[PDB]
Amino acid sequence: KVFERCELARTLKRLGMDGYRGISLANWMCLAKWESGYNTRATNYNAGDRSTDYGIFQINSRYWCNDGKTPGAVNACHLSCSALLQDNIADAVACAKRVVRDPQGIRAWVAWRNRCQARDVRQYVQGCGV
Numbered sequence: 606k607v608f609e610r611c612e613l614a615r616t617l618k619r620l621g622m623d624g625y626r627g628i629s630l631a632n633w634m635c636l637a638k639w640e641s642g643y644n645t646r647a648t649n650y651n652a653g654d655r656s657t658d659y660g661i662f663q664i665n666s667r668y669w670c671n672d673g674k675t676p677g678a679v680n681a682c683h684l685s686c687s688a689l690l691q692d693n694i695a696d697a698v699a700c701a702k703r704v705v706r707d708p709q710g711i712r713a714w715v716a717w718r719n720r721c722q723a724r725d726v727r728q729y730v731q732g733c734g735v
Contacts, residue, residue, distance in 0.1 A: 606692035608643040608661070610634070611733035618735045620698045626705045633701070634729035635721035636714055637661050645697070646690050660689035662701045662714070669700055 608616070614634055617623070623630040640663035641647040649658040656667040656675045666675040670686035682700035689697050704713050711717055 614733040614735045631726040631730045635726045639716045
């Protein structure tokens with residue numbers, strides 16, 4: 606599923622993402638926008654290390670989810686990577702929360718550093734009623 610902007614903002618708010626570990630809803634929006642264009646079925650194979658990024662937040666198989674084909678990987682979110690490809694983003698959100706529980710927080714995603722960090726991200730939630 607490809608979420609519409611405000612649709613996703615309200616869905617994320619309902620899932621308890623606003624201010625989770627100090628991260629504003631607008632930052633989560635900016636992250637999903639740049640990682641996948643708000644697309645839950647998006648996948649990206651990393652030929653360089655044989656890992657794959659899954660879903661709306663493009664979560665990597667090396668440490669977060671299990672896909673069975675990534676060398677010496679772990680599954681911190683305790684989910685099959687398939688769970689990160691559902692239209693229902695509850696599992697993906699649970700996993701994203703797990704990611705930010707680590708020291709890097711939102712910085713875990715390099716795209717966030719490149720296009721969200723230190724920027725005016727208000728535009729992502731304006732008019733959404735969140």
